[PDB]
Design a protein around this ligand. Structure first.
Ligand SMILES: CCCCCCCCCCCCCCCC(=O)O
Ligand SMILES: [Mg+2]
Lengths: 204, 214
């Protein structure tokens, strides 16, 4: 672990590339997501270590639910497991997303209010059945009243899978965010990816 | 080009750093930012891009020193006036309820056809993301309204955003329209614009895998 001069208060993670990763290894499109769980744990461990205040994970969106059922099952199960495995660890967990839906997993409903609030420990947010449109129109003041109001400004956003876009992640919080793209697919996560992103951030 | 974006956003950043690096004062770069805009336009009209939105300046850019605000305001006025000469449908979006908004651009705050028109050129002039979103929270009876009633409502979704000056960020440009926008960063400052910059950005967009969804 290298020594850092600047550190971002809030990191956003877009863990994209799961399907392409599976295809490139001769697996089915849906068989990459489960390999996304441990990388989530690695990012958590490294963040708690260097003392990052807040991390927001892109879980899945209402747009992602329009993908085939065998994929939706895979990334929903992968997301559920990811939250549960971070629940085990010492973290203030919040899940933001449209609960008023069959699609939202019952397992995660208990995290839609921040657990272990004000214990002076890292905050980990998950976007689960999230939509930018759903988020903004949640208001009915407004900026304070958006669904994602508890999630503050994003300083550094890191996306895996080589695509440079927000895919509708936190339009309000990301307005000024520095974006770092990793070309490697999420399941091919290396600690070097995160370190190189933190190096990019401190050079601003 | 096989694929073309319907709507390109331009963040013409790097003017001050470009000036400094040529032993000029910070404020003296912006005027060298006018012609590059004209070049982007010509190329966009040539290949038949439907819509281009230029980031002019924000309500945040007005907090900068007065010698700089003067310069980039004048550069923007001149850019619009020079595009107004050509064949474009021109719109300016920004907070007109302010001293800071240039009187010279008030007439363009409703889309204005000039020459043969066709291509839509937008300018963000005294723009702010917070102003844009809250514009809807005026007298909108529901949420289905708000999105349709944001200040920038007339500006549709952005397909490709190209930013000069080597920084990968939106700087609060059209948060609603940029949710799915592919972002291409040119390392060179805006005044150092070469056609190759735009052509590479259009290659990047063409090269995107359409199987992958949003
Ligand atoms: C929550 C951290 C670990 C999650 C493990 C993988 C399952 C999450 C699903 C990944 C897809 C989300 C990113 C898609 C981006 C896009 O829509 O373009
Ligand atoms: Mg700048």
């Amino acid at each position: 672990i290298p020594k850092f001069k600047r550190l971002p208060r809030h990191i956003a993670i877009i863990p994209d590339g799961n399907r392409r990763w599976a295809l490139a290894r001769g697996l089915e499109k849906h068989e990459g997501y489960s390999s996304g769980i441990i990388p989530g744990l690695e990012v958590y461990d490294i963040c708690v270590k260097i003392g990052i205040g807040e991390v927001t994970f892109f879980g899945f969106t209402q747009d992602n639910t329009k993908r085939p059922q065998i994929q939706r099952k895979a990334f929903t199960d992968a997301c559920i497991k990811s939250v549960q495995e971070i629940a085990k660890r010492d973290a203030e967990i919040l899940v933001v997303g449209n609960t008023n839906s069959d699609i939202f997993p019952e397992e995660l409903l208990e995290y839609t209010k921040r657990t272990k609030v004000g214990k002076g420990k890292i905050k980990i947010n998950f976007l689960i059945n999230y939509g930018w449109y759903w988020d903004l129109t949640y208001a009915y003041k407004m900026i304070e009243n958006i669904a994602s109001a508890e999630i503050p400004r994003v300083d550094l956003l890191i996306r895996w899978g080589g695509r440079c876009r927000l895919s509708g992640m936190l339009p309000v919080q990301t307005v000024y965010s520095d974006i770092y793209v990793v070309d490697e697919m999420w399941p091919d996560f290396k600690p070097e990816h995160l370190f190189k992103a933190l190096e990019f951030y401190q050079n601003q």
